[PDB]
Design a protein around this ligand. Sequence first.
Ligand SMILES: *[C@@H]1O[C@H](CO)[C@@H](O[C@H]2O[C@H](CO)[C@@H](O[C@@H]3O[C@H](CO[C@H]4O[C@H](CO)[C@@H](O)[C@H](O)[C@@H]4O)[C@@H](O)[C@H](O[C@H]4O[C@H](CO)[C@@H](O)[C@H](O)[C@@H]4O)[C@@H]3O)[C@H](O)[C@H]2NC(C)=O)[C@H](O)[C@H]1NC(C)=O
Ligand SMILES: *[C@@H]1O[C@H](CO)[C@@H](O[C@H]2O[C@H](CO)[C@@H](O)[C@H](O)[C@H]2NC(C)=O)[C@H](O)[C@H]1NC(C)=O
Ligand SMILES: *[C@@H]1O[C@H](CO)[C@@H](O[C@H]2O[C@H](CO)[C@@H](O)[C@H](O)[C@H]2NC(C)=O)[C@H](O)[C@H]1NC(C)=O
Ligand SMILES: O=C1N[C@@H]2[C@@H](O)[C@@H](O)[C@H](O)[C@@H](CO)N2C1=O
Ligand SMILES: [Ca+2]
Length: 475
Amino acid sequence: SNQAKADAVKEAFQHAWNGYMKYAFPHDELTPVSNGHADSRNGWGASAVDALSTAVIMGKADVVNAILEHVADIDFSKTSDTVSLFETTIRYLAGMLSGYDLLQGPAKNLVDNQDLIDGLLDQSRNLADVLKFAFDTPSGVPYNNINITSHGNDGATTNGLAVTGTLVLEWTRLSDLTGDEEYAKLSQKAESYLLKPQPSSSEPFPGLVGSSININDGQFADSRVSWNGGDDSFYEYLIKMYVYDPKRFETYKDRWVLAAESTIKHLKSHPKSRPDLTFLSSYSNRNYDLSSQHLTCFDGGSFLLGGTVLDRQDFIDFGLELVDGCEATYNSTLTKIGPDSWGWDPKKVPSDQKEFYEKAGFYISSGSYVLRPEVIESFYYAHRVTGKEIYRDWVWNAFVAINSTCRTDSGFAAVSDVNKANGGSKYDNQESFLFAEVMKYSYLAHSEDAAWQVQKGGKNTFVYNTEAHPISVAR
Ligand SMILES: *[C@@H]1O[C@H](CO)[C@@H](O[C@H]2O[C@H](CO)[C@@H](O[C@@H]3O[C@H](CO[C@H]4O[C@H](CO)[C@@H](O)[C@H](O)[C@@H]4O)[C@@H](O)[C@H](O[C@H]4O[C@H](CO)[C@@H](O)[C@H](O)[C@@H]4O)[C@@H]3O)[C@H](O)[C@H]2NC(C)=O)[C@H](O)[C@H]1NC(C)=O
Ligand SMILES: *[C@@H]1O[C@H](CO)[C@@H](O[C@H]2O[C@H](CO)[C@@H](O)[C@H](O)[C@H]2NC(C)=O)[C@H](O)[C@H]1NC(C)=O
Ligand SMILES: *[C@@H]1O[C@H](CO)[C@@H](O[C@H]2O[C@H](CO)[C@@H](O)[C@H](O)[C@H]2NC(C)=O)[C@H](O)[C@H]1NC(C)=O
Ligand SMILES: O=C1N[C@@H]2[C@@H](O)[C@@H](O)[C@H](O)[C@@H](CO)N2C1=O
Ligand SMILES: [Ca+2]
């Protein structure tokens, strides 16, 4: 049953890994339609590193060894492109760190070469060392777009909320494993400005803050509140840091609880045509933006995690409502895959979507699907927290729809219109998170229990970074 399904996901992973190895390895990614390669992540082999934690969990030794051997020859000091501190941190840094915690722990019997495993930590350190100058600013808020050779930057005056608040988990984990406090100090200092917002007008409601921060003084530059892309990950890490080490980050939890409560009270929103559906809106100076993104669907999972860890049934209940809403965007389309963005503002319903809106509860703003995992991610937590089978089926239904409409001879491709036969047209693009997240959460939902699985209450020994890379908790 679930075993057969678990094997089905491993086949889909193997399928993409074979196509990647066949036409793109060691480049960052496979272009799934032309069977070529691309390097959108500085050329260190993003898809190989992002696939590591998933391969280890799936018990694929051959894949794990091939990746470890490539990690050994990476020179993180050379790249012809500018580097994103955020992208590099959540994929490469967390990816190697995850592999290390996994192979050194619950998966210790999977690989023989202990040198390739220790190399993961060494390379993680080398990577942080080449990037840390990004934090050398007046406030400590880093420049996200840097040139690692000249030490130059974007010239940017502000740094985004998510790009600033989604670094602490992996940089602190690096300090905890190396004994060198420098990494934790830098990221935590940048995070400090987000925990104590100034001006006070940048925090419209308790716990909800603006979307950008001034690099010079660390003050917020706007009061736009949102859980959408650009903001998302900041709130996610608030509660996750608490799970990582409740003794050191109790303060992060308090801030998350404030954010969670204000979100329920002010951002909660129901479509006119479907009062039974719940989505999150955006807020700016008293005005509400009645639209959301596939990216935002990570929210249900956040509420569920904090809910079970804090034993707050109200967060769990709200999280389930967010999960239902996102599930609604998936099962209402022709392909059974949800759109990249949608809206429910009665005054802006497109004429050609009027009837869709009346029955579904929303209209599609962008119908593309770029292999994102947020909806499956939240379905995964819903199942782990409630133990209900329905959420596991929703993961399966989504996986089959992706495998059926996105699959190509070499891998999986992004699609242009989830509300058209076969997804409209295929994009020649396969992001590394296909390996890291879509395949992992889909597999975990049907695989056996293990330390790396999300747990209820205070039993978690691993916490997932925003790219689905399991990191071992502190102590
Ligand atoms: C396509 O997407 C649809 C939208 O997500 C999805 O619809 C359903 O999805 C959920 C299916 O389980 C369903 O949620 C459940 O709703 C139960 C009934 O709700 C009604 O009664 C309650 C009274 O308490 C009212 O408050 C509601 O407004 C509504 O009138 C509810 O009993 C149930 O709660 C139990 O289970 C949860 C955990 O699963 C516990 O936490 C809880 O304590 C209860 O034990 C749960 O909330 C949801 O209502 C429904 N959505 C809508 C709007 O229709 C479709 O299933 C999906 N289609 C396919 C084919 O996949
Ligand atoms: C990062 O900064 C370095 C500076 O060392 C840039 O190096 C290039 O600078 C010029 C750009 O055309 C040319 O002189 C060479 O291409 C090269 N020379 C140096 C100084 O090494 C590099 O282009 C920057 N990275 C990018 C592409 O943004
Ligand atoms: C995902 O898609 C693949 C390919 O369409 C399915 O595997 C197929 O493998 C062969 C063709 O590629 C054939 O044997 C079948 O078309 C099919 N496999 C079976 C079941 O016979 C794969 O089953 C799909 N995954 C799921 C679980 O639906
Ligand atoms: O804006 C984004 N945030 C998410 C990330 O948190 C991660 O899930 C993937 O990089 C990818 C997944 O949808 N990310 C984005 O594009
Ligand atoms: Ca994420």
